[PDB]
Amino acid sequence: AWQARGLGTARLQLVEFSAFVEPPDAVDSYQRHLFVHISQHPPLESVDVRQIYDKFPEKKGGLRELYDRGPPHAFFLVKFWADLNWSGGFYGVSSQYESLEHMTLTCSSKVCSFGKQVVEKVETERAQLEDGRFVYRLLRSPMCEYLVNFLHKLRQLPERYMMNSVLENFTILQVVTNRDTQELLLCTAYVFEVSTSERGAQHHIYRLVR
Ligand SMILES: O=C(O)c1cccnc1Nc1cccc(OCCc2ccccc2)c1
Numbered sequence: 001a002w003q004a005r006g007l008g009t010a011r012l013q014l015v016e017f018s019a020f021v022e023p024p025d026a027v028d029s030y031q032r033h034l035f036v037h038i039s040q041h042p043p044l045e046s047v048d049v050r051q052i053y054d055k056f057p058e059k060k061g062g063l064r065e066l067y068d069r070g071p072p073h074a075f076f077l078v079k080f081w082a083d084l085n086w087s088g089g090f091y092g093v094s095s096q097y098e099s100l101e102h103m104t105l106t107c108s109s110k111v112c113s114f115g116k117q118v119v120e121k122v123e124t125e126r127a128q129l130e131d132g133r134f135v136y137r138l139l140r141s142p143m144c145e146y147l148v149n150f151l152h153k154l155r156q157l158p159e160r161y162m163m164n165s166v167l168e169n170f171t172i173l174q175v176v177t178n179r180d181t182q183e184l185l186l187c188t189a190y191v192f193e194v195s196t197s198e199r200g201a202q203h204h205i206y207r208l209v210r
Contacts, residue, residue, distance in 0.1 A: 003043035012185040015096040023089045033086035049208040057117045075208035076188045081195035091143035097136045102127040104179040119146045163194040
């Protein structure tokens with residue numbers, strides 16, 4: 001009855017999320033290539049979280065501990081089929097959330113390889129009042145150089161199944177918390193495959209249950 005139908009909770013809803021590259025010539029005629037993209041402008045299916053425990057960090061800030069803090073309804077798994085056909089351009093990530101209440105968000109994004117945290121980015125965004133609800137805009141964050149280099153290497157692999165093998169061990173954990181109260185608002189686990197290109201980016205969102 002109170003089961004999510006999109007990625008978010010009654011406190012904080014994902015509006016839009018994308019990762020993209022704009023070619024250097026974008027200044028002349030604009031174009032951006034979307035690696036992955038969620039736009040949220042029946043209940044979702046569910047995946048038991050224990051199955052994905054070892055794809056993410058441990059001991060602290062890991063999935064089990066986070067799920068242990070709660071709240072359980074705030075945990076989502078997103079599977080992406082990334083579009084890897086698109087050098088020297090701008091690699092960016094854009095996130096947008098909204099809420100009924102005014103908070104200061106802290107958003108932590110962790111890239112893990114074989115479950116070991118490899119890179120982490122932490123950002124805060126203060127609410128902006130706008131049309132009844134509050135909007136949080138973390139737009140055009142530069143991709144970190146580890147991911148850009150990873151994408152350039154990945155795009156070079158001679159077989160799609162080889163990119164999928166490599167991506168089997170690559171995950172991203174995103175945890176959004178109330179900066180002031182420390183309460184977790186949204187935790188999203190991302191897992192990745194490569195899209196055949198022809199099909200651009202796709203995704204499938206699941207609730208994480210236990
Ligand atoms: O923004 C950053 O530097 C950043 C830093 C630390 C952690 N996470 C970050 N961002 C982020 C979050 C979620 C997805 C995403 O990229 C999808 C592209 C992609 C990557 C690999 C295989 C296929 C497709 C980027």
